[PDB]
């Protein structure tokens, strides 16, 4: 049959790459992925955080963050 | 015929499904893989959304992960 | 003492029957239950989805859905 | 006397309790059984709700399951 | 190194004491803690519930409640 | 150098971090301990909040527990 791509294997392939993470509650990040665990907690470097003010606006740059996997909506490998 | 939810998803592997997330985001896409949390990997994705003006396509995406913590409902072949 | 009815045993008794599921976020379904797991993920056939537009309005019919147990608010055996 | 939350619920089996869910739904009902997730089965249920016009009874229900993912607070004999 | 204070050890130290619990969704309680588990479910006695009507208003007194750990935002040992 | 999220937090023990919770509460504080759920104990805390008038300090607190179910993001030395 097809190739099966498990979720945690997809994320694993993302390490070293700039990814885009959409978090619940209208906050979005672009960052390079350094690690993750089974809960889909992630460590991003070189981050840009985007929000939505009155469309998509950058609201911050940061060196390093942790994003909580309990708060992730969607991840986009390749980063946009 | 008792159908386990995971066995329903498993049958959809390589097919298009329709996924209604929490927060009125909806995604049509080809299911590539999944886990017991209903974390899913979708390809060939159209993102729908809701705009004051019905349901509008607001995006096209390739390989994503949708967080199972954030899924509401899944329509096999929707 | 009384009869104890465990939650997963209640759902088990629902198999084959039309149930009513209230999901978080003002979406409601009536469907025949075909399976479920320990997370309260469910497979419904013959479904009517109701929402709330400006009271309770039917918004869709579907053949088969999966409802995520992480998003369930309440289940009503017998279906209304 | 340390009281484990589950041992508090266990004592309520066969009695009326008051359950405040997430999202301003509230339920008075007779507790029939439960699990460690605070999934609960309630009988003889009155559903309260909030309406612009206080707390209004918006429904009467028989045997339900209330999802523990969605519970905020539980009042023994409320 | 420093003293490490694990979350469940902090709560353990609170038993017998009046604590303040902020729950998600703008509801707050002050109560004496009688028990808790690994999910951060808690049993409070002698409770005051505060809400926010049009600032912080007391909305109820209760003898005993259970607060669901899935709905806790923050706990404050010492109680304000 | 693969960095596990828990190993990132572990390095912050005894240092100030910045924690963005769900619901637009934000907390600067000294990390005292944590668990795999990202439950955390913070000291010497300033609570920020959002007020129609930017980001306003709305409180000062001592030893709290922040619920990991309710964390969005964590900035080491923010």
From TrEMBL, chains B, D, F:
Residue ranges crossing the lipid bilayer per the database entry: none
GO molecular function: RNA binding
Main location per the UniProt record: nucleus
A Gene Ontology BP annotation from the UniProt entry: mRNA splicing, via spliceosome
Sm domain boundaries: 4-78
Location of this chain's protein in the cell: Nucleus
Assembly: LSm subunits form a heteromer with a doughnut shape.
Protein family per UniProt: Belongs to the snRNP Sm proteins family.
Role played: Plays a role in U6 snRNP assembly and function. Binds to the 3' end of U6 snRNA.
The protein's name: U6 snRNA-associated Sm-like protein LSm5
Gene: LSM5
Span covered, complete protein: 25 to 113 of 121
């Amino acid at each position: 049959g097809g190739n099966i791509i498990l979720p945690l294997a997809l994320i694993d392939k993302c390490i070293g790459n700039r990814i885009y993470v959409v978090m619940k509650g209208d906050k979005e990040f672009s960052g390079v992925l350094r690690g993750f665990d089974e809960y889909v907690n992630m460590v991003l470097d070189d981050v840009q955080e985007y929000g939505f003010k009155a469309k998509r606006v950058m609201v911050n740059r940061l060196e390093t963050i942790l994003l909580s996997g309990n708060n992730v909506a969607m991840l986009v490998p390749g980063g946009d």
